[PDB]
Design a protein around this ligand. Structure first.
Ligand SMILES: *Cc1c(COP(=O)(O)O)cnc(C)c1O
Ligand SMILES: *Cc1c(COP(=O)(O)O)cnc(C)c1O
Ligand SMILES: N[C@H]1CCCCNC1=O
Ligand SMILES: N[C@H]1CCCCNC1=O
Lengths: 423, 423
């Protein structure tokens, strides 16, 4: 039987998030190859995980090398050279002598470890996060995505401003209200995405995040910046907070850090990560195969000038999309930084009413045409584009061209679409 | 500076479990190589993760192949061929048409997903587990290692029988007591290790586990067998429950499944893993590089006859150790199955008083001599031996020979040992 039907027979639905019957057998560059040999351009970049695309030589080199002479299998009960070299590279990239690293398998395990560490270091359980935030899918990362003392704030959206205040100041006022109503010093941490991912690739208003961080610092609250989606060159700066005029206390990394292998990291003050031992650990954490891949990703970002590539190619992509908006009225807003781009689809440009149903057919048709992308947003109406940082300019143009065909040929049965749960 | 000091400077203590300053730069076969070039025989097999040791050709082949042509990076929003092939191989190995697979990064994420799935499928939160059990190190796997409705039982130890009943029947009676005091049907699952790992490599009494599973089945309670430590050929059968006259409802796998890469799996009734979608998911789950490694491990177990190897080489190891016991009185008990072996150290053979302090020096000295092993047990007095399944017979003998030197040359300052937290 076909690969997709074998996938239904053999793998439980528990971890599936399917939008169309993508059945992959290989990959090269920014393209996926299906079982039948059909190629698709991957604008999703595996939700951002395939930072160097598929079969990049630096990944091949590193993982093949480490597999043939691995420095053990772990950082728990052994130091290993690749893990320590990666830890030093990551701390050197982050504004010296103050921070250390913890390694994980995923953004979920990293946000969980950051939260457990700061609650253990401070003796406080309270936590600030945002409605619609995505910090992972484990009990400990879902606690704030519940924790006692959880404060959930609206994420300020330029396209849908809270209290009709485009600046986000009303959100800051709400925070101060929420903090005033609980004891001084009861809040351990604030988790923030510097571009809200599942919330709909929302770039906050100018100045908001720095003012938010200033409030947190006035209350002694650690500012944790989750850059699992938009970190490591994707935004057109190495770290996305570089666009925003603040430095967080803690940085969470994942997804594209591993280049297609499972790798996450927390960069945090030494006192936070040294407050306990044998406390947040999984046996394969810091294994040298995945550490080697991480080192390859950082080295490639430098060697291939991918921070600048992401900036340049993002501008190309957003320009392509604004040409599409001249003819496809469904496009309401085009936004993002670098190669993290969102395209919000609306039934009408004036009311901004979300276009959920059309977005799910759009991506299905795109898939039928040879282009992979997914949707996000509380209303299921934002196209997410996070392609491999190594996607060529011509591929960017082929993808916009296929998207133009999908907006035009918008054909997919309401029955065919209903076969996929998605979200 | 030296690698171990760089590890202290760069990596937080949060995930460290260190017993001596092992600082690894490479690996080959069953040997680790330190930064200075010193070789050590790895009796720990990276806590059981290095099922094929270090740089095994099947791992090299598979991971190099997949890195150069990866079928995407995930099972969430795409099917992929390696993941589905691995899922089918795993279900084919487990007693047809009833079970599916969920893929994870770790034993912690797998035991967490198994627990969340069965609680979602049943609408019940209660859970049976054992004192001293190790099911992982995340909030969701620590919940039963707390969950409402948690019942914790003593694990029956032939060397220290509960209520002086060597059979374990008193533990079964205790269970029934605990179940009688809560509503019929309030318990979702029972988590069991078929050889208790951190509890001290405890093989339960004959017949206990089957009688335990029979009780659970009489109450409609799903029996989850955590074989992250002693699964996949290590015990001298493919699945350790094969020694025990029962079949669990759910099987949890990890550690050596990945051959040094992060890979876990839950094999569970279809109704359990299909009760929700987009429910327990992490982006790199089912990535094809780690799936390829898993397939290599299963293929190698078949090609290299490693189930029989583990049985044969375990008998050799335990025989070697009984020769050591004729001269080293500290050895109280030698136990286990296949290549999961525990050696319990006692101050006196008659009282069985644990020998904690000597065990920690012993392993330090072993390390100084070129042999890596760790200790476990509630009293820190059981040597754990879980070497690579590909460890040669001669290496088994070199390791017993180095251990003999360590028991003899037992030299390590009480100050030097105190520099390592361990547990
Ligand atoms: C992907 C993502 C996570 C979770 O990472 P997983 O690898 O799926 O566990 C956390 N935060 C953000 C912002 C993400 O995009
Ligand atoms: C190692 C182990 C776990 C946890 O696996 P991690 O990879 O450390 O998360 C779970 N159960 C048992 C029996 C184990 O030995
Ligand atoms: N004994 C368990 C817990 C210690 C950390 C690593 N995993 C194990 O082998
Ligand atoms: N948008 C998040 C959550 C969906 C599952 C995968 N991870 C992501 O990219």
């Amino acid at each position: 039987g076909n690969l997709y039907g074998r996938d239904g027979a053999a793998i439980g639905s528990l971890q599936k998030l399917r939008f169309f019957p993508l059945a992959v057998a290989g990959g090269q560059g920014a393209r996926l190859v299906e079982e039948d040999g059909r190629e698709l351009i991957d604008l999703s970049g595996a939700w951002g995980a395939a930072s160097l695309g598929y079969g990049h030589p630096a990944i091949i080199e590193a993982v093949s090398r480490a597999a043939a002479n691995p420095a053990g299998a772990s950082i728990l009960s052994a130091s290993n050279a690749p893990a320590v070299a990666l830890a030093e590279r990551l701390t050197a990239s982050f504004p010296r002598g103050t921070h250390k690293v913890w390694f994980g398998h995923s953004g979920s395990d990293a946000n969980e470890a950051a939260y457990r560490a700061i609650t253990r270091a401070t003796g406080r359980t309270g936590v600030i996060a945002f409605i619609g935030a995505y910090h992972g899918c484990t009990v400990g990362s879902m606690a704030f995505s519940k924790a006692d003392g959880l404060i959930l704030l609206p994420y300020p959206d330029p396209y849908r401003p809270y209290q009709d205040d485009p600046t986000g100041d009303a959100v800051l006022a709400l925070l101060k209200e929420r903090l005033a109503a609980v004891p001084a010093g009861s809040i351990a941490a604030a988790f923030i995405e510097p571009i809200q991912s599942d919330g709909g690739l929302i770039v906050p208003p100018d100045g908001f995040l720095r003012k938010f961080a200033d409030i947190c610092r006035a209350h002694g609250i650690s500012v944790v910046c989750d850059e699992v989606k938009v970190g490591l060159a994707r935004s057109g700066r190495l770290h996305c907070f570089e666009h925003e005029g603040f430095v967080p206390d803690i940085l969470v990394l994942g997804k594209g850090l591993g280049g297609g292998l499972p790798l996450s990291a927390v960069i945090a003050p030494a006192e936070i990560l040294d407050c306990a031992s044998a406390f947040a650990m999984q046996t394969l954490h810091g294994n040298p195969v995945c550490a080697a891949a991480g080192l390859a990703v950082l080295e490639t970002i430098e060697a291939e000038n991918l921070t600048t590539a992401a900036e340049r190619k993002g501008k190309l992509l957003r320009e392509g999309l604004a040409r599409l908006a001249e003819r496809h009225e469904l496009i309401g807003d085009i936004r993002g930084r670098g190669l993290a781009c969102g395209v919000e689809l609306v039934r009408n440009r004036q009311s901004r009413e979300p276009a959920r149903a059309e977005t799910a057919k759009l991506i299905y048709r795109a898939y039928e045409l040879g282009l992979v992308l997914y949707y996000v947003g509380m209303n299921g109406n934002v196209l997410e584009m996070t392609p491999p940082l190594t996607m060529t300019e011509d591929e960017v143009r082929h993808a916009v061209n296929l998207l133009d065909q999908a907006f035009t040929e918008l054909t997919v049965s309401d029955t065919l679409v209903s076969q996929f749960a998605g979200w």
